[PDB]
Amino acid sequence: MGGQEHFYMETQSMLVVPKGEDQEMDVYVSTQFPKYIQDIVASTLKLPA
Amino acid sequence: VEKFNAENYWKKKGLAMVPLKFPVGLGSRAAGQAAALVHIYLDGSVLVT
């Protein structure tokens, strides 16, 4: 049995924006898991959540 | 200061002391209500507003 592509009509899309203060990051993503985006972004930036 | 004012005509020193009772209070109880929202994320960090 073969696989399957999701083929969501909206492709992977995101806009990440630094606030300019205390390394704050606002991350606007087409995702199913905002908490996971928060974890992996903060971990990559060595920042608290 | 009074010794200075006795020895000088075109220049005068002055001294004064005032007391303070600044009462603190709004007109009603509803005017003094306040609210907040605190989050604790799974890494231990806290966001407060």
UniProtKB/Swiss-Prot annotation, chain B:
Cystine bridges: none
Domain of life: Eukaryota
Induction field: In liver, is down-regulated by adiponectin and by the PPARA agonist, fenofibric acid.
Tissue: Abundant in liver, expressed in adipose tissue and at lower levels in lung, skeletal muscle, pancreas. In contrast to mice, no significant gender difference in AOX1 expression level (at protein level).
Annotated localization: Cytoplasm
Additional record remark: AOX genes evolved from a xanthine oxidoreductase ancestral precursor via a series of gene duplication and suppression/deletion events. Different animal species contain a different complement of AOX genes encoding an equivalent number of AOX isoenzymes. In mammals, the two extremes are represented by certain rodents such as mice and rats, which are endowed with 4 AOX genes, and by humans, whose genome is characterized by a single active gene.
Quaternary structure annotation from Swiss-Prot or TrEMBL: Homodimer.
Similarity-based family: Belongs to the xanthine dehydrogenase family.
Function: Oxidase with broad substrate specificity, oxidizing aromatic azaheterocycles, such as N1-methylnicotinamide, N-methylphthalazinium and phthalazine, as well as aldehydes, such as benzaldehyde, retinal, pyridoxal, and vanillin. Plays a key role in the metabolism of xenobiotics and drugs containing aromatic azaheterocyclic substituents. Participates in the bioactivation of prodrugs such as famciclovir, catalyzing the oxidation step from 6-deoxypenciclovir to penciclovir, which is a potent antiviral agent. Is probably involved in the regulation of reactive oxygen species homeostasis.
Name of this chain's protein: Aldehyde oxidase
Gene this protein is translated from: AOX1
Span covered, complete protein: 993 to 1041 of 1338
